[PDB]
Structure formats: C-alpha cells, structure tokens
Curated annotation (Swiss-Prot):
Interacts with SUPT4H1 to form DSIF. DSIF interacts with the positive transcription elongation factor b complex (P-TEFb complex), which is composed of CDK9 and cyclin-T (CCNT1 or CCNT2). DSIF interacts with RNA polymerase II (Pol II); forms DNA and RNA clamps that stabilize Pol II elongation complex while maintaining the nontemplate DNA strand in the transcription bubble and nascent RNA in the exit channel. This interaction is reduced by phosphorylation of the C-terminal domain (CTD) of POLR2A by P-TEFb. The chain holds residues 276 to 396 of 1087 of the full protein. Ubiquitously expressed. Belongs to the SPT5 family. It is found in: Nucleus. Residues 1-31 form the KOW domain. Methylated by PRMT1/HRMT1L2 and PRMT5/SKB1. Methylation negatively regulates interaction with P-TEFb and RNA polymerase II. It comes from Homo sapiens. Residues 38-102 are annotated as: Interaction with RNA polymerase II. Component of the DRB sensitivity-inducing factor complex (DSIF complex), which regulates mRNA processing and transcription elongation by RNA polymerase II. DSIF positively regulates mRNA capping by stimulating the mRNA guanylyltransferase activity of RNGTT/CAP1A. DSIF also acts cooperatively with the negative elongation factor complex (NELF complex) to enhance transcriptional pausing at sites proximal to the promoter. Transcriptional pausing may facilitate the assembly of an elongation competent RNA polymerase II complex. This is Transcription elongation factor SPT5.
Length: 102
RNA sequence: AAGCGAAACGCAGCAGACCAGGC
DNA sequence: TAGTATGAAAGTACTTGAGCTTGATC
DNA sequence: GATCAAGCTCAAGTACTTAAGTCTGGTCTATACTA
C-alpha cells in the first residue's frame, strides 16, 4: 500500500497508490487520478456518467469502467496495472493532500 | 391676473533580432 | 504516441622578458 | 680588481572598453528525443 509515480505517458510525475501487488513481479495495480478530457490535462475525479454520456470507447460495469485504450477505473479513480520498472517505489513521500486524495 | 363638469445592473503585455526609411 | 527533452579599430593601462647599477662577495 | 644576483628600466605583448540624437514602418522567431 505504498505510493509510486509513473515514468511515461501523460501520468508522468503523478502520485499513484499501490492497490494490489502481483506476485509475478511484472505489473502492479495502481490507483491514479485520471488526467483526461473524457474524449471531449489537469488531475480531476473520474466521471463515469460523463464518459458514458460522451460515449466513444467506453464499457460500463457499474462502478467499474473501461475506456480509451483499456484504461480501467474501479469506483471514481483509475485502477490499472503498470510495469514494475515504469514506476518508482522509493523516495515518493506523498503529502497530506495526496493522502486525502487517496 | 387667472379659473370649470355651473429591483437590480470602461483590461491586459511577449520580447528580442534584422531590414528599409525619416530630419 | 504522446510526451518530455536535446579583408577596411584604436586607444590606454598592465604584465612580461631583456639589459644594466650597486651591492655582497672574493 | 673581478664576479653574480637583485632589481630597476625599457620595448614587446595582452585585456578591455568605446564608437550622434530621436522617430516610423516592415518581417521573423526550434525540434530532437525515444520513450
Ligand atoms: Mg529638416
């Protein structure tokens, strides 16, 4: 239940909460705040209803949702697997605002 | 002197080059 | 992909090596 | 009587600045990386 930051992609230098750690040592499940415009980027809370209304590449499974290139989001935050080497697990130290967000 | 129906409402800048021209 | 990252200037003032006076020595 | 050394004087460099006044108009201005 540590915190990491992605290296590539738009989520670069963004705090992510390690939700589940896969024993395979290949990818780890991470909770991010989506930096998306909803197919219409500052961090903002996920709007499943908004993305459903906008349509496009979207799959609705209640609280779970898949959109825009297999991007997964459980509840209102992206819940996606990311490579072990694509994130930094040492020297993150999130602030109180980050703790409140996650 | 006269006399009629007696609520709420005046923006904003790059900057820095280089050229031509003016007395 | 999607985004971060890589040939027609001249002047003075100051420092340097060469030559030379007076010294301390011989 | 002579010498070499210290150090003062001179002509050869180097380091550094400065180069009229104001005004108008016009164009033009990064993309490599490497994931
Ligand atoms: Mg004139």
């Amino acid at each position: 239940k540590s915190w990491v930051r992605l290296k590539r992609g738009i989520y670069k230098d963004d705090i992510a909460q390690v939700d589940y750690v896969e024993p395979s040592q290949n990818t780890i499940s991470l909770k991010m705040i989506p930096r998306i415009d909803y197919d219409r980027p500052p961090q903002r809370l996920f709007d499943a209803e908004k993305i459903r209304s906008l349509g496009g590449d979207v799959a609705s499974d209640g609280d779970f949702l898949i959109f825009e290139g297999n991007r997964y989001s459980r509840k209102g935050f992206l819940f996606k697997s990311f490579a072990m080497s694509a994130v930094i697990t040492e020297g993150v130290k999130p602030t109180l605002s980050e703790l409140e967000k996650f």
